[PDB]
Write an enzyme that holds these catalytic residues in place. Sequence first.
Site, PDB file in Angstrom:
ATOM      1  N   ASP A 170      76.579  19.803 -44.303  1.00  0.00           N
ATOM      2  CA  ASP A 170      77.427  18.970 -43.470  1.00  0.00           C
ATOM      3  C   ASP A 170      78.522  18.446 -44.419  1.00  0.00           C
ATOM      4  O   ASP A 170      78.353  18.513 -45.634  1.00  0.00           O
ATOM      5  CB  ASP A 170      76.643  17.798 -42.823  1.00  0.00           C
ATOM      6  CG  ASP A 170      77.465  16.946 -41.862  1.00  0.00           C
ATOM      7  OD1 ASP A 170      78.519  17.431 -41.380  1.00  0.00           O
ATOM      8  OD2 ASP A 170      77.080  15.783 -41.620  1.00  0.00           O
ATOM      9  N   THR A 185      80.747  21.386 -39.822  1.00  0.00           N
ATOM     10  CA  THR A 185      81.136  19.998 -39.617  1.00  0.00           C
ATOM     11  C   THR A 185      81.711  19.675 -38.252  1.00  0.00           C
ATOM     12  O   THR A 185      82.514  20.448 -37.713  1.00  0.00           O
ATOM     13  CB  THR A 185      82.081  19.530 -40.760  1.00  0.00           C
ATOM     14  OG1 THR A 185      82.583  18.217 -40.476  1.00  0.00           O
ATOM     15  CG2 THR A 185      83.284  20.482 -40.973  1.00  0.00           C
ATOM     16  N   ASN A 186      81.351  18.459 -37.745  1.00  0.00           N
ATOM     17  CA  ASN A 186      81.916  17.852 -36.564  1.00  0.00           C
ATOM     18  C   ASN A 186      83.123  17.129 -37.084  1.00  0.00           C
ATOM     19  O   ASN A 186      82.991  16.133 -37.791  1.00  0.00           O
ATOM     20  CB  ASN A 186      80.944  16.868 -35.870  1.00  0.00           C
ATOM     21  CG  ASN A 186      79.926  17.527 -34.966  1.00  0.00           C
ATOM     22  OD1 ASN A 186      79.871  18.752 -34.824  1.00  0.00           O
ATOM     23  ND2 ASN A 186      79.052  16.723 -34.382  1.00  0.00           N
ATOM     24  N   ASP A 223      72.973  14.641 -42.786  1.00  0.00           N
ATOM     25  CA  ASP A 223      72.608  13.230 -42.915  1.00  0.00           C
ATOM     26  C   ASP A 223      72.208  12.635 -41.548  1.00  0.00           C
ATOM     27  O   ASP A 223      71.790  11.472 -41.477  1.00  0.00           O
ATOM     28  CB  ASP A 223      73.757  12.411 -43.551  1.00  0.00           C
ATOM     29  CG  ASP A 223      75.051  12.408 -42.777  1.00  0.00           C
ATOM     30  OD1 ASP A 223      75.364  13.429 -42.147  1.00  0.00           O
ATOM     31  OD2 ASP A 223      75.773  11.399 -42.831  1.00  0.00           O
ATOM     32  N   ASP A 283      99.071  30.341 -79.176  1.00  0.00           N
ATOM     33  CA  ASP A 283      99.326  31.399 -80.140  1.00  0.00           C
ATOM     34  C   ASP A 283     100.816  31.787 -80.104  1.00  0.00           C
ATOM     35  O   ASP A 283     101.635  30.906 -80.320  1.00  0.00           O
ATOM     36  CB  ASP A 283      98.308  32.562 -79.942  1.00  0.00           C
ATOM     37  CG  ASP A 283      98.473  33.734 -80.884  1.00  0.00           C
ATOM     38  OD1 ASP A 283      98.047  33.618 -82.051  1.00  0.00           O
ATOM     39  OD2 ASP A 283      99.120  34.732 -80.477  1.00  0.00           O
ATOM     40  N   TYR A 304      96.905  40.025 -91.404  1.00  0.00           N
ATOM     41  CA  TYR A 304      96.884  40.779 -90.144  1.00  0.00           C
ATOM     42  C   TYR A 304      98.323  40.999 -89.574  1.00  0.00           C
ATOM     43  O   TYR A 304      98.583  42.051 -88.993  1.00  0.00           O
ATOM     44  CB  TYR A 304      95.940  40.131 -89.120  1.00  0.00           C
ATOM     45  CG  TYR A 304      96.544  38.981 -88.334  1.00  0.00           C
ATOM     46  CD1 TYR A 304      97.214  39.204 -87.133  1.00  0.00           C
ATOM     47  CD2 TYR A 304      96.435  37.668 -88.787  1.00  0.00           C
ATOM     48  CE1 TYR A 304      97.780  38.157 -86.414  1.00  0.00           C
ATOM     49  CE2 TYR A 304      96.972  36.607 -88.060  1.00  0.00           C
ATOM     50  CZ  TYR A 304      97.638  36.855 -86.869  1.00  0.00           C
ATOM     51  OH  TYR A 304      98.176  35.813 -86.146  1.00  0.00           O
ATOM     52  N   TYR A 330     105.629  40.468 -83.246  1.00  0.00           N
ATOM     53  CA  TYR A 330     105.452  40.269 -84.708  1.00  0.00           C
ATOM     54  C   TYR A 330     106.487  41.001 -85.538  1.00  0.00           C
ATOM     55  O   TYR A 330     106.555  40.814 -86.765  1.00  0.00           O
ATOM     56  CB  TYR A 330     104.088  40.828 -85.139  1.00  0.00           C
ATOM     57  CG  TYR A 330     102.887  40.103 -84.584  1.00  0.00           C
ATOM     58  CD1 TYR A 330     102.296  39.057 -85.286  1.00  0.00           C
ATOM     59  CD2 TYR A 330     102.277  40.527 -83.403  1.00  0.00           C
ATOM     60  CE1 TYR A 330     101.160  38.417 -84.802  1.00  0.00           C
ATOM     61  CE2 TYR A 330     101.140  39.893 -82.912  1.00  0.00           C
ATOM     62  CZ  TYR A 330     100.583  38.845 -83.620  1.00  0.00           C
ATOM     63  OH  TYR A 330      99.465  38.221 -83.147  1.00  0.00           O
ATOM     64  N   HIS A 344      89.806  30.400 -82.130  1.00  0.00           N
ATOM     65  CA  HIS A 344      91.161  30.783 -81.757  1.00  0.00           C
ATOM     66  C   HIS A 344      91.436  30.855 -80.255  1.00  0.00           C
ATOM     67  O   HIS A 344      92.538  30.526 -79.830  1.00  0.00           O
ATOM     68  CB  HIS A 344      91.587  32.099 -82.437  1.00  0.00           C
ATOM     69  CG  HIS A 344      92.981  32.519 -82.063  1.00  0.00           C
ATOM     70  ND1 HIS A 344      94.098  31.827 -82.530  1.00  0.00           N
ATOM     71  CD2 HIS A 344      93.399  33.477 -81.201  1.00  0.00           C
ATOM     72  CE1 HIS A 344      95.144  32.412 -81.971  1.00  0.00           C
ATOM     73  NE2 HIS A 344      94.775  33.406 -81.165  1.00  0.00           N
TER      74      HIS A 344
END
EC number: 3.3.2.10
Lengths: 546, 546
Positions: free
Chosen positions: B8, B122-123, B184, B334, B382, B465, B523
Amino acid sequence: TLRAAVFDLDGVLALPAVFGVLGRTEEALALPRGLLNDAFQKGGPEGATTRLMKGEITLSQWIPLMEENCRKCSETAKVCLPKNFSIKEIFDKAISARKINRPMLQAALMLRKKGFTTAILTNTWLDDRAERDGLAQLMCELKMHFDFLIESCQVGMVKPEPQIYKFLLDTLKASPSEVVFLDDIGANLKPARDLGMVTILVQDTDTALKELEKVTGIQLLNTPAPLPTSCNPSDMSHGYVTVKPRVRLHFVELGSGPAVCLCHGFPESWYSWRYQIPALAQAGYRVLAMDMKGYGESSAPPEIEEYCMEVLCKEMVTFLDKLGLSQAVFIGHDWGGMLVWYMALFYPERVRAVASLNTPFIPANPNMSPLESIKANPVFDYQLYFQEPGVAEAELEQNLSRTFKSLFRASDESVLSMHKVCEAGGLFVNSPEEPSLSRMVTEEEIQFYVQQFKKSGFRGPLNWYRNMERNWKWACKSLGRKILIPALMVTAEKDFVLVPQMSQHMEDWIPHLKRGHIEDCGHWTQMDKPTEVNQILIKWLDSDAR
Amino acid sequence: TLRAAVFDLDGVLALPAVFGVLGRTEEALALPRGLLNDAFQKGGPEGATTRLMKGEITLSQWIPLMEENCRKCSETAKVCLPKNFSIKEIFDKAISARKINRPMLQAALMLRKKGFTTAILTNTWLDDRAERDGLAQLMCELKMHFDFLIESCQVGMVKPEPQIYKFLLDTLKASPSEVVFLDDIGANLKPARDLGMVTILVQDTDTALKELEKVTGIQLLNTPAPLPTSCNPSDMSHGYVTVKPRVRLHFVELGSGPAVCLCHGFPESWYSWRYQIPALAQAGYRVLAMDMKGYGESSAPPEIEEYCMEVLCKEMVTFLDKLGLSQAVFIGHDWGGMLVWYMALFYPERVRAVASLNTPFIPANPNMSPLESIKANPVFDYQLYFQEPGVAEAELEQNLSRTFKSLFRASDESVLSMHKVCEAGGLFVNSPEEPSLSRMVTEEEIQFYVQQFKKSGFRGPLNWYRNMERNWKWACKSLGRKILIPALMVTAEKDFVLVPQMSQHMEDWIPHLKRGHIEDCGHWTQMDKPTEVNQILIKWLDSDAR
Ligand SMILES: FC(F)(F)c1cccc(-c2[nH]ncc2-c2ccncc2)c1
Ligand SMILES: FC(F)(F)c1cccc(-c2[nH]ncc2-c2ccncc2)c1
C-alpha cells in the site's frame, strides 16, 4: 564587392555601451570629467585593462587593479572618491543594463539572409563574476545569428592592434575590400580602414544603418516585420526515449527552465513548432518538441489500438518518468491539442499547465455514438474518409510533395474544400498535380516533411482517427471532472473546421480558462501566425506556468 | 511459494499516513473524537471520498464536498468548527509532510533484487491542487523501483471492492498463494486474505518487516547498507548534438533543475556515472552524462589534434550553445577532471561551478617541457607508454573483457602496477588472461563497456594523452589567471597515481576552493565509493551551485 559584415558588440550590437557608464557615473557623482575613463585606460597597452582584454587575467582579478587605478587618478586630480564607491557594482549594473540593439541585429540577419558572411569582433573579458550568467545568456542569444564570434580575450589580441584585423580577414577567408566593419570607436575603425575595409562609425543606429544600406545596396531600414527565428534540424539536440519495448519517442530539446512539451497535429512533425522553439527557450523555458507516436523519428507500430488516447497519454506519462520530469507544461495543436486536454483530465499532477491551439475541449456525449457525432458536422467529413484502412494512406502517400503543398496553405490560399470528401473520393480530387508553393513555407521546409514521411508513411498518423469508440468510452469516465489547473485556449479566426465558436462552452468545464485569439489565421496556426502564437504563449507561460 | 510483494502507499511505503492527520487535527483543535474521520468516510461507497478514489472527480472538486460533510458531522455532534478551519490547508500540510518510508522501500528493492515481482496498489486521487508537484515528485521517485503501480482513480475501482484484487492478480499474472500483500488497513487486507494471499497488517515498519522476512525467507532487516540506484541504459533518455560536421556528442539525460554536466575519464563512458545520475536528478538537478569525444556513441575521429584540450573545450561550449544552455555545473573525473579545470579557466561565464574527482589542478610549468614533467614522476610512466600510436591500442583492444576486468578494481584488488609499464612492454604483461571479477562491478556492467568499446576502440581515447605539447602551450596562456568561480576538489585516499598530496597547492590558484576526501577509495571513485561521492556532490551542489 561586399560579402562580409563585421560588428562590434559594445555600442553596436549591444546598448547602452558599458563604456558610457564610466561617463554616466562621473556626472552622477560630480567627479572630475573623464576621471573614471582615464583610470580605465591607465597604462594603455601595458595597463590592467589591456591584460584583461587579452585574457591574461579575469574580470574579478581586474576589479581591484581598476580601484587602485581610480585612486591614483583621483589623487593626481586633487579629488576624492565617495565612501560606498564600488567598481563591482558600477560594472554589475552596466552589464545588466546592456541589451541587444534589436535593429542592428535585424540588419545583420538581413545581410546574412542575402548571402553575407557575418561576424562579431569584440574586445571582451573572461567573466567570473557571481552574476556572469546574464552576459553569458546575452552572448548565447547574439552569437547563434552569426558565422563567427571573435573575442579578444580568447584570441590573446586586442583592437586596435593590426594582428586582430589580419586574424579577422583570415577567419572570413575574404580580402579587405569585400568587408564592412561597424564600430563605435574611431581608433578601432582606423586599422580596418588603413587595410581598405569599408568602415562605419556608429553613433546612432539609424544613421549607421543608412550608411550600411547605402554601401551594401540592401534595404535594412523600414523593412517589413521579420519572421521569428526558425530551427535548422541538423543544429538541434535530438532526444530518444524508449517508452515500451516496441515504442520509442523522438524529441528536439532547447533551453533551460520549466519543461514545455510541444505536441503537434496531423500530419505533422516536431518541425511544425520551428518558430516557437527558439522563442520559448529564449523566454526562459526548456522546450521538448515531440515527434508524436507514428511520426518522424518516433516509432510507428501498425496496430490501430496503439493510437487510442488512453495509450498515447500513458506513453507521454512514461516519457516524463524516463526523463525524470515530475511535470511539464503541455501545449498541443490539432490532434496534439486533443491529447493535451486528456493529459489535464487524466494526469493533472503531471501537467504544470495546459494550452491548446485551435482544438477546443468538448466533453464526450454519453447519449450519442462518436460516429453519429462526427456525421452531424459537415466539416468533419474528412475524418470519415480517414476511417477505412488504406484508402487515405494510398492518396496521401501517392505524391508526398503534393500532399504537403496542398495541405500547408494560408486561409486565403486553400486548394482543399473540407466538404463532401468521401463523396468526392478523396482530399485531392479537385486539387492540382503540382500545387503552387504557399507563402507560409519554402521548398526546403516542404522537403523536410517529405523526407520525414518517407520512413513510416501515413498509417500510424491516420490511426489517431481510428479509435473514436475507444476514446469515447475512455473520455466518458471523465464526465464528472473539471479542468482546474492553469489552461489556455487559443482560437484561429479562419480555421474552417476548428472554428472559434466550437470553444464557446469551455468555461463550463474549465472555469478559470484563459484565452487567446488569432485574427486572419488558418489551420496551420504556428507557421501561419508565428509572431502572434509566440506572444500569446510567452505571455501566458510567464503569468500562469511560473 | 511467494513470487510477488504488493505494498500500500499510505501508511506503508509513505509516512506519516495522510489518514492519521484527520485524527491529529481533531486533537489539536479539541474537536469531538473521530469527527473529521467520520466526515471523510460519509456516505461510504456512495459518498464523496469513494467518487474521488474511483477517479469520478478531482481533489479540488472534493474539497468543498468534504467541508460540506464536516459541517453536517459537526451539527449532529452539537459542536463547532473554528473560524479559519481549512480542509485544503489540512491536506496541503499532510501530503507535504508525507515522505517515503525508506526501510519499507529498501525491503521491496531487496525482494525485487531476489526475483520478486513488486507492485504498489493504492487508493488515491487525481491531484489538481496548485501544490500537486510535491506528490507527483514522490510518486515519480517511488514508482521507478516497482514492476507495477495500480492507482484506484486510474482503474475506477477501489479497495476493499473484490474486483480491484482480481485486477491486481491479473496484472501480476500470479495466483493468490504466490502473493504477499502489505496494508495498514485491516478492512483492505480482508479481500486479499479471503482470496488466499499472504497478508501483513502494517502498524510499525519493523514488525511488518519481521513478518515479511519470516514469510519470504529473505533477510530484509539488519541488512548491509545498499548501493545507490543505478542506471539501466535502455531506460534512459539518450541525447545527440552535432558540434561540427564530423563530430557528434552523445549524452544521457535525467531530471530537472540546474544543468550538471558529468565528464568521465579514461577509458570510460557516460555509464561510469551510473550511481550518480539517479541521485543527482533526485536532489533537484538536470543531469547530462556525457560520452566524451572518442567514446561510446560520440564520434571518434582518428586525428590526434582532434583531442587537444582547446578543441575538446570549444566543442563542450558548442554543446551548450546547441542545447540552449547559457551555463552548466561541470563535474569531471580523471581526464574529464582535467577538462573541467580548463572549462573554468577559459570559459568561466559558461561554468556555473566546477568539481573534480581525483584530478588536481596543476598549472603548466612554462620552464619545463610537458614530456620532461611526465618523466619526473614514476607513476606517470603509463602515459609515456600511451604516446606511440598503435602500441597501447593493440594491447587494450586484444581482449576487451580482460582490459576492463584488469582496470576496474578496488584499491585492495589491483592486478596492475603503474610502475615501469614501458620497460615491462605493456599494462597486462604481469596480469592474468582471465582476471577475476572485482567486487565493484558485475559481469553485465563489464560487458556494457566491452560493447561500447567495440565501435571505435581505443584510438580516440588514447589520443587525449597525445597532445601534451599542444595542451602545455594553451595552458600557459592562463598562467596569470585564478579560478574564482565555485569549485570543489575531491581526493581519493588510495589513488596511487592521482595522490591526495598532488592537490596540496591548489588554493594558491583557487583561494575559495572547497574540498571532499574519500577514505579507502581507489582510482575508480564513482563505482568504488558511490554513496560518499553522492553525499559530497549533493552537499556541494546545494550550497554552492544554487
Ligand atoms: F487532411 C485534411 F483533411 F485536409 C486535414 C487534416 C487535418 C486538419 C485539417 C484542417 N483542419 N482545419 C482546416 C484544415 C484544412 C483545411 C484546408 N486545407 C488544409 C487543412 C485538414
Ligand atoms: F590504463 C591505465 F594505465 F591503467 C590507467 C588509465 C587511467 C587511469 C589509471 C589509474 N590512475 N590511477 C590509478 C590507476 C589505476 C591503477 C591500477 N589499476 C588500474 C588503474 C590507470
